[PDB]
């Protein structure tokens, strides 16, 4: 590809970047602020296993 096109793309990425590297945390760690939150957090752990 052209030097111009690559350059311009690499510029535009600064404004529409995507996630390319991530470190994950399990989703059940967010089960919070709800009735039976502590129980739902375990059932979501088990459901992720399933």
């Amino acid at each position: 590809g052209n030097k111009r096109r690559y350059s311009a793309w690499a510029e535009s990425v600064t404004n529409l970047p995507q996630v390319i590297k991530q470190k994950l945390t399990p989703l059940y760690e967010l089960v919070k602020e709800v009735p039976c939150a502590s129980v739902k957090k375990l059932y979501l752990k088990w459901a992720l296993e399933e």
Partner: protein, 518 residues
């Protein structure tokens, strides 16, 4: 005659249903037994019939609205959504007579580009948008800052996210193949013979015989085959849309049409509902554009050339001299010559191009037969941001919108929709049609069936082509009825277009037979 127009057939009526206690009406309907095709007569647009009734019984009042009632629409809206500075009714009732309107969204805010398309239901069996089912202009407050580049948007209440997850996949495959083969011979025969006698004795006798023969044969054969395959495709993705899972605000029109559905099951009304709004709505979609180019070239040349020659000579002279003299010269010949030359040149080309999303300028220039300039592909992909197609869709059936929050007898309506939808999938299938010729695909189009004729085919049945023979792909006939319960089963004869004829193409899809629990 080759073609024979087949007129629409539709069943005798159902019974009249019992009078609907809410609608104070009764209903009757018919099934499309046979779509019209090949310029057949179309049936009257009266597969539904309706009657009024005496109110043999009352019914439940329309579901209580705890909120404010929008005068014209009757949209039940929350009292916090009055004097809001927004129209939440589709009507000014909410804002009508407000002593003070507290503008929340004071800034300049755009709607998400094409977001209102996604509020349209789709007919999944056609994959085609229908009437609006969801109101994506209802904001219910909101006014969180959402930006794309420098442009800030106001998200609909219904939409969970609309986010510019940009991506692009190009794919280019070019395959060129050549073969030539050449064959010649040259072959020659010549024969010459002489025999003569000359003697003295007085007496004298002489004889001479002359023989010449030539034979020549030549043969030439040539074959040249030249084949080009060129498939190019661009998949561009520009935004990810997801609908909220819960508490959707329906469009007025869909709301009302639902409100008018009969409580007793009668297929005709749910059929009309699907024909207005379709069967499913879009929960999650990937928005972007497609470009796809596919060229096929076959160049086949053959030459055959033959030469045959025969030559024959005979002369005989016999002379007897003793005065006395007698002589005879006797000579004869035949020549034979044959030349035979046969040449054929055949070129078959087809191209198909396909584009979705973007501006008409770019769409059409990409629809020309030449592969595009990178510049015009840039311009097209720029313009797809603003007018994208829907590449990926995840859909839920429309009955999942029918919710007690909105409708009396919600469960009953829901179940009716399930039943109706199941019948609708049968009645709208393309399987019903008579087969096209010419490898045509019958597309059922309401009460009549259209053959989409391929590239290089023409006419109502695709019967016109200059290609003598081309592979015909197999097409299923309609799946059988449900087998009576001892287990449940269906079968498909793969018959409606025979897969084998004319160098028959692909066999039909699997399964040929489908079985289930009752």
């Amino acid at each position: 005659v080759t073609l024979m127009p087949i007129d629409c057939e539709l069943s005798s009526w159902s019974s009249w249903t019992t009078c609907d206690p809410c609608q104070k009406k009764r209903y009757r309907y018919a099934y499309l037994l046979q779509p019209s095709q090949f310029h057949g007569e179309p049936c009257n647009f009266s597969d539904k019939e309706v009657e009024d009734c005496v109110t043999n019984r009352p019914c439940r009042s329309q579901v209580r609205c705890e909120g404010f009632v929008c005068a014209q629409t009757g949209r039940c809206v929350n009292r916090r959504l009055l004097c809001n500075g927004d129209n939440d009714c589709g009507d000014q009732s909410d804002e009508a007579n407000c002593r003070r309107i507290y503008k929340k969204c004071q800034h300049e805010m755009d709607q998400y580009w094409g977001i209102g398309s996604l509020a349209s239901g789709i007919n999944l069996f056609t994959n085609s948008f229908e009437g609006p089912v969801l109101d994506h202009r209802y904001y219910a407050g909101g006014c969180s800052p959402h930006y794309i580049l420098n442009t800030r948007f106001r998200k609909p209440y219904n939409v969970e996210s609309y986010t510019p997850q940009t991506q692009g996949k190009y794919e280019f495959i070019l395959k060129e193949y050549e073969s030539y083969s050449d064959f010649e011979r040259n072959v020659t025969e010549k024969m010459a013979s002489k025999s003569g006698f000359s003697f003295g004795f007085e007496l004298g006798i002489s004889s001479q015989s002359d023989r010449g023969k030539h034979y020549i044969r030549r043969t030439k054969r040539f074959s040249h085959t030249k084949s080009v395959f060129l498939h190019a495709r661009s998949d561009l993705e520009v935004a990810h849309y997801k609908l909220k899972p819960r508490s959707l605000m329906l469009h007025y029109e869909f709301l009302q049409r639902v409100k008018r559905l009969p409580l007793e099951y009668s297929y005709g009304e749910y059929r009309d509902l699907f024909r207005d709004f379709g069967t499913h709505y879009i929960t999650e979609a990937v928005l972007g554009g497609i470009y796809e180019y596919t060229l096929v070239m076959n160049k086949e040349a053959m030459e055959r050339g033959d030469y045959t020659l025969n030559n024959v000579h005979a002369c005989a002279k016999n002379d007897f001299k003793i005065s006395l003299g007698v002589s005879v010269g006797k000579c004869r010949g035949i020549l034979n010559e044959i030349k035979d030359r046969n040449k054929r040149d055949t070129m078959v080309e087809d191209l198909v191009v396909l584009v979705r999303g973007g501006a008409s300028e770019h769409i059409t220039t990409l629809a020309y037969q030449e592969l595009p300039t990178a510049d015009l592909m840039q311009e097209w992909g720029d313009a797809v941001q603003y007018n994208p197609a829907i590449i990926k869709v995840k859909v839920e059936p429309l009955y999942e919108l029918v919710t007690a929050t909105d409708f009396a007898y919600s469960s009953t309506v829901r179940q009716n929709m399930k039943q109706a939808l199941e019948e609708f999938q049968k009645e709208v299938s393309s399987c019903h049609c008579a087969p096209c010729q010419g490898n045509g695909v019958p597309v059922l189009k309401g009460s009549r069936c259209d053959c989409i004729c391929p590239v290089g085919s023409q006419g109502l049945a695709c019967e016109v082509s200059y290609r003598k023979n081309t592979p015909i792909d197999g097409k299923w006939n309609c799946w059988s009825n449900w087998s009576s319960c001892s287990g449940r089963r269906k079968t498909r004869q793969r018959q409606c277009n025979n897969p084998p004829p004319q160098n028959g193409g692909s066999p039909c899809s699997g399964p040929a037979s489908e079985t289930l629990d009752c």
